[PDB]
Amino acid sequence: HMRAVQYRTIGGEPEVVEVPTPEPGPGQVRLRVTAAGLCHSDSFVMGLPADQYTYGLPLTLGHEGAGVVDALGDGVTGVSVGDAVAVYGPWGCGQCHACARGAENYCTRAAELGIQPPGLGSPGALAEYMLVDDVRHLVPLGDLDPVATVSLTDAGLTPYHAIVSSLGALPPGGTAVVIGAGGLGHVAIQLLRAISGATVIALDISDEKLQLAKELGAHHVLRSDDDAAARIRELTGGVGAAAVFDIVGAQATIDLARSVVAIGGVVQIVGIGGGTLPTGFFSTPMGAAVRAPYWGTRTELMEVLDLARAGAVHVEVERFTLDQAPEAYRRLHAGTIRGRAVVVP
Amino acid sequence: HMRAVQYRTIGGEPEVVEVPTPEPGPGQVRLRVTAAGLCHSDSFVMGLPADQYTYGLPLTLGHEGAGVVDALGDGVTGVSVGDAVAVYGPWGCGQCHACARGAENYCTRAAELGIQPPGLGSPGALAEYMLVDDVRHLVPLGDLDPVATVSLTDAGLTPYHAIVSSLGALPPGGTAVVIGAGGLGHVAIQLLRAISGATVIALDISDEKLQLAKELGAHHVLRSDDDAAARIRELTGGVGAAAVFDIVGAQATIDLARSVVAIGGVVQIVGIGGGTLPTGFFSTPMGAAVRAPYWGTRTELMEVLDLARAGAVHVEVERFTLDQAPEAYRRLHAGTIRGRAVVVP
Amino acid sequence: HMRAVQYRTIGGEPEVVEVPTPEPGPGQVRLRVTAAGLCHSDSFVMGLPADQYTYGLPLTLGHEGAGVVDALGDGVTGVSVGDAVAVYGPWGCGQCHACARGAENYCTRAAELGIQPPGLGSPGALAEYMLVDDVRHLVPLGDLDPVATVSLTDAGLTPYHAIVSSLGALPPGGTAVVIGAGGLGHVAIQLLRAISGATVIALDISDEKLQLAKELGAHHVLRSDDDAAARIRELTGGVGAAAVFDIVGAQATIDLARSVVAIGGVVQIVGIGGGTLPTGFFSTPMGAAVRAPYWGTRTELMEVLDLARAGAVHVEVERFTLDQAPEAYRRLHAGTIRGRAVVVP
Amino acid sequence: HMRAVQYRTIGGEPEVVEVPTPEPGPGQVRLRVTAAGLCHSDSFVMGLPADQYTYGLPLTLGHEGAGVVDALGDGVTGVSVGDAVAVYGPWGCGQCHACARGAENYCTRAAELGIQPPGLGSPGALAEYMLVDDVRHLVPLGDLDPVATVSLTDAGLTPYHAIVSSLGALPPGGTAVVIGAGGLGHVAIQLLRAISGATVIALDISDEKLQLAKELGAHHVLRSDDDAAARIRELTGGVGAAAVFDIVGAQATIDLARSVVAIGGVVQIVGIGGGTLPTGFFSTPMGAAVRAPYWGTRTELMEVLDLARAGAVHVEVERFTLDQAPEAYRRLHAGTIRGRAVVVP
Ligand SMILES: NC(=O)c1ccc[n+]([C@@H]2O[C@H](COP(=O)([O-])OP(=O)(O)OC[C@H]3O[C@@H](n4cnc5c(N)ncnc54)[C@H](O)[C@@H]3O)[C@@H](O)[C@H]2O)c1
Ligand SMILES: NC(=O)c1ccc[n+]([C@@H]2O[C@H](COP(=O)([O-])OP(=O)(O)OC[C@H]3O[C@@H](n4cnc5c(N)ncnc54)[C@H](O)[C@@H]3O)[C@@H](O)[C@H]2O)c1
Ligand SMILES: NC(=O)c1ccc[n+]([C@@H]2O[C@H](COP(=O)([O-])OP(=O)(O)OC[C@H]3O[C@@H](n4cnc5c(N)ncnc54)[C@H](O)[C@@H]3O)[C@@H](O)[C@H]2O)c1
Ligand SMILES: NC(=O)c1ccc[n+]([C@@H]2O[C@H](COP(=O)([O-])OP(=O)(O)OC[C@H]3O[C@@H](n4cnc5c(N)ncnc54)[C@H](O)[C@@H]3O)[C@@H](O)[C@H]2O)c1
Ligand SMILES: [Zn+2]
Ligand SMILES: [Zn+2]
Ligand SMILES: [Zn+2]
Ligand SMILES: [Zn+2]
């Protein structure tokens, strides 16, 4: 009845399979999927041992989703069949203190209630159709290209969230360091330019990726190696960086972040790569804050899409078919994706 | 001993005159003036009746000052002879709650203590030399061109201050309206682009000035006439503008601001033009805030200069000599200055 | 089938009448009403000429509602029959930028969509039963006394909102002025003590009401008369008040607010009493902001109720029956209610 | 010429000694010391090995200072002989971006320029007289008791700073945990009550100290032991604490802080006790921030003193003479000081 990309066996690769076409229950909506982004978080999930994997098998992947509204569940109002929409991913209960400010990413009853994001417990977007639990998890696209913008649902939303949180500690004329210019990173750079006055130093491990970072707005680019810290120190007059966004989050990138963050600065550990930053006296500088944020808010998604509309941010897309999804994931693990891999089913 | 531009007779024009070269008292510094901006606030001061004028005669004009440090007063440390510096203008006591956060513009003991800005009570910058009361009112220029950047001391500082105050009410994807694209206005536009994601609508009364506004970053430009409000309504989907910066502040521009500010929006009345905005229920929308800010903070000046360094903002300058200062002021009143008039003595 | 208090004829008084007991449509919930507060906003609505009145006749009054969940509409989840809940009143669309941060009070599509608060267009709480449009407009009471706390839905929520907005301009050791110690006012005073370090000056026109204000936390109380401004000036060392909350909002109380707000201060015009504050240069001080807020946010309601739980705030209640509702409204207009009139049907 | 308490030999105890009475150089002021607080930071400094100790020998101790102005240095204005003043301790350059907002605690040129706080490099307050570098490091006392309030210069200032930084993450009705109810801790508790709506859970290791914490405003007190985490979990409905202030900062107290901080919460590591908090994914919860703040700002000091004036905070003082300073330090290390040890010379 419909085609989809699923994780089905622990330690195995994602596979294109045929599954039932779902029907919207009451409250729910079905989208005909127009675009679906691939995220390195998916590689992280599939790289988990059986004892640590909690999302059930099979799992349709894909938590960056956009589409056209296909069918309405019982009692649904707010959207009409035919509306083009992006999917807000980090679902929450809707009612707690956090959910009420739109910050369903920090919902305090989601684990207890078994609420799970699409592609991370609930059925994802890498399919011809998908279900969304509730109308508040849908944002209008207007006449934004779904393929061009779908990744703003995470590749944009997540670093935007990290940046907005950090703005107090990034005055104009301060310096922001971005470690990793990939899916999130290449959007992170653009977002720092759009809404701060900060000088942006990007880092990565291919010249080719550094060149894209330069073009996307990075004032300075640097290889992520042993020299990085000292060059960043030189670039900031020895003061260090007011803000550091680590989009890798390995021990070594975190170590780098610790050596270059300024007095009173902030480190957002965005990338999930196995490290921790030892925060405390004589480890991190005085006044320096460290945080590992997760995804972002409903308002923030809308805001990121509005930046797309205004031409202030865009995704560098590498386009694929549904059948190529496995192939594309292999490319992503190998580091041969330029920007974001996006599937059009 | 030195040449200067002064206001000497009520209702009269500024004149080039010869005066004593001042010597720095203890705490004070003398600058050899490298650049001096002209502001429409000066026209406002000289247009005051005798009973309302409080700055004493004669008065050397010019509150946008930059220079090279010429001589040190007794006990001065912090600066060296030869340092290039911008002058922070809205002087305060240094010690009250406001002064301590750097916001000497909102100093609560300045009037009581007779503290007055250079060119607005104290001797100004339109001269070959000038005195600054204290070292904390000097900011380093580095290798910024004094002539290009001097006006960032007010033409930049003032609207930057207004914008920073308003950022909470300007999410990315909201709309900011700028009424008046003159000295402050043409910098205001650039600053909104540098540090917000907001769509900028500029307004003015010459096509020529609107064209410069477009080039400087305004997404949309509009003649400031009877149609303005409805076009702004159309441009925002009928919601109105999240923020309005009125750099004219006449009753009519204020009236315009009131008709277009959105629910929960903000109006910064920056221009001094004789009006007031009737703020209250069924006059201003629910949640809408109105403010008449003054100048800006010490940190904000530094921040604006750092934006100049990073190429994010600049002043469109029209250059003059000291002898042409009167001529230049006539031009400013007539509306035939492109950006900012700057004198080099 | 059920008893209710309605406004039925323009210029007439509210009447106890018998109406149909409503049934919950899909999405909706019915409450058995445990308490219903009376607000002076209701007097304002009933005092409107026919051409300005937009809520339709008849209208069941009462926008401060609490209850026990009586029946669930089709497809409703989140609440169970038997749950004790407060009603969040300033309803919005749920989906716009403002609604998504919980600030349905500043919803930008409510007027267009005909969305109306209970007791202010939709059927209110002064009845044995009431309908709520959606589950997100219900907050749990836990084991808070509905009668004691119901007025926190507006009498608390509204000034809390005004205070939270103003906190940046109320450092500890600054002074907050509260003009009017009535339903909102007597809670406003308590809230300023709970969550700021500000010295509180309350004002009113009866000694008896001033005495309650003193007891509820006001550091200083003053008759609202010609001497008020100078006493407030003396009390602040001539600086003025960092924040002023006018809970009357008549021209004279607004005039008072203008004369006493400090440089860089803020005025929240909370009371609806026909005035406007002329905001602008030489009318309001430099940096002073003026705002007419409306109600508050979803998070703020929860926060106010949590303060009640912690014993940090309470409502001084004057208790009535449904039959006494008209009588109680007469008392409120005459100024002989101590704190808040609350009806228990 | 004058008596003072100094650290003179590595690993040795502080001694009362006779030294020259200092004279104010230009810019400087001499205080006749009216009170001098003892801080556990001093124990930390004296417990340092020779290779890690950087403050030179001898060193007059005492960084909580208050006094009466005794003599003016050359060119000093702002203060008069006879003015009662508290000493702002975390000195900075005065001119950098941080210093300009008053945050000399986060000055980015202090280490480079050898600027050192009184009692932590510069000569301290535990003496009959002391020198202050500049007038901006003095705050007026008014008619506050120097002995009662002197410790607000650090015991108050430091946690106030930590709390103010955390307020965004402490809505009213959230929970704040304070680990350690000593000099800073017992003020921290009061400050959380004064300026937030948060429920306060204090912890310590003596019943006697816990009892004082209860009296000073702690809603709940708990022994700092193996049960602490679970009781805190029970007390917050399993959500955890929105904010945790660790005033011990040992590995075990930091471990406790990590287990109880909520999703989106914040940990301020205030105490210097040798630990670090491993901040990062699956170590700290999503959105949780960790920071090790240092001292506070100029505005914050003023604000804390203004809270004292208003009766909102006070120091529980244990009074000593200069000769008893060594004895008092022994007591502090042994944990037999109730609140703050204060010396009156
Ligand atoms: N916190 C969140 O909510 C959240 C959300 C989405 C993704 N993520 C995480 O963010 C990280 C990045 O995701 P993505 O989709 O952008 O990955 P990606 O594969 O698109 O990009 C990774 C980039 O990191 C670069 N890189 C690798 N090692 C590096 C090093 N030592 N120094 C500098 N650069 C280095 C690569 O060259 C590449 O450009 C992942 O760990 C992912 O799980 C986190
Ligand atoms: N608040 C403060 O602290 C502060 C500081 C500096 C200047 N100002 C004030 O700001 C205002 C502008 O100063 P400036 O130096 O930029 O003046 P300017 O002469 O450089 O520019 C004025 C601009 O306003 C435009 N204008 C005039 N009427 C208009 C209308 N009805 N609609 C749209 N545009 C209109 C003109 O065409 C011109 O471009 C003045 O009133 C000045 O006194 C205030
Ligand atoms: N902005 C909003 O969203 C919102 C919400 C609710 C109520 N309100 C408005 O707030 C105002 C107060 O409502 P309430 O229910 O507390 O009224 P109330 O009748 O309970 O209290 C009014 C109080 O104001 C006092 N007062 C009257 N004139 C005064 C003066 N000149 N100076 C000082 N005190 C004076 C009275 O003595 C009384 O104590 C009303 O205008 C109401 O419509 C606004
Ligand atoms: N970050 C800063 O800028 C700054 C400033 C001043 C002081 N400090 C540091 O703050 C800490 C406290 O200073 P103080 O003067 O208040 O010390 P103090 O001696 O006055 O108080 C210490 C308190 O901690 C309690 N305590 C010890 N171990 C504990 C545990 N495991 N659990 C709970 N409570 C415990 C003690 O019983 C005592 O009440 C020190 O480490 C000091 O160096 C930091
Ligand atoms: Zn992802
Ligand atoms: Zn939730
Ligand atoms: Zn000016
Ligand atoms: Zn001042």
Ligand SMILES: [Zn+2]
């Ligand atoms: Zn009301």
Ligand SMILES: [Zn+2]
């Ligand atoms: Zn809405």
Ligand SMILES: [Zn+2]
């Ligand atoms: Zn200390």
Ligand SMILES: [Zn+2]
């Ligand atoms: Zn500094």
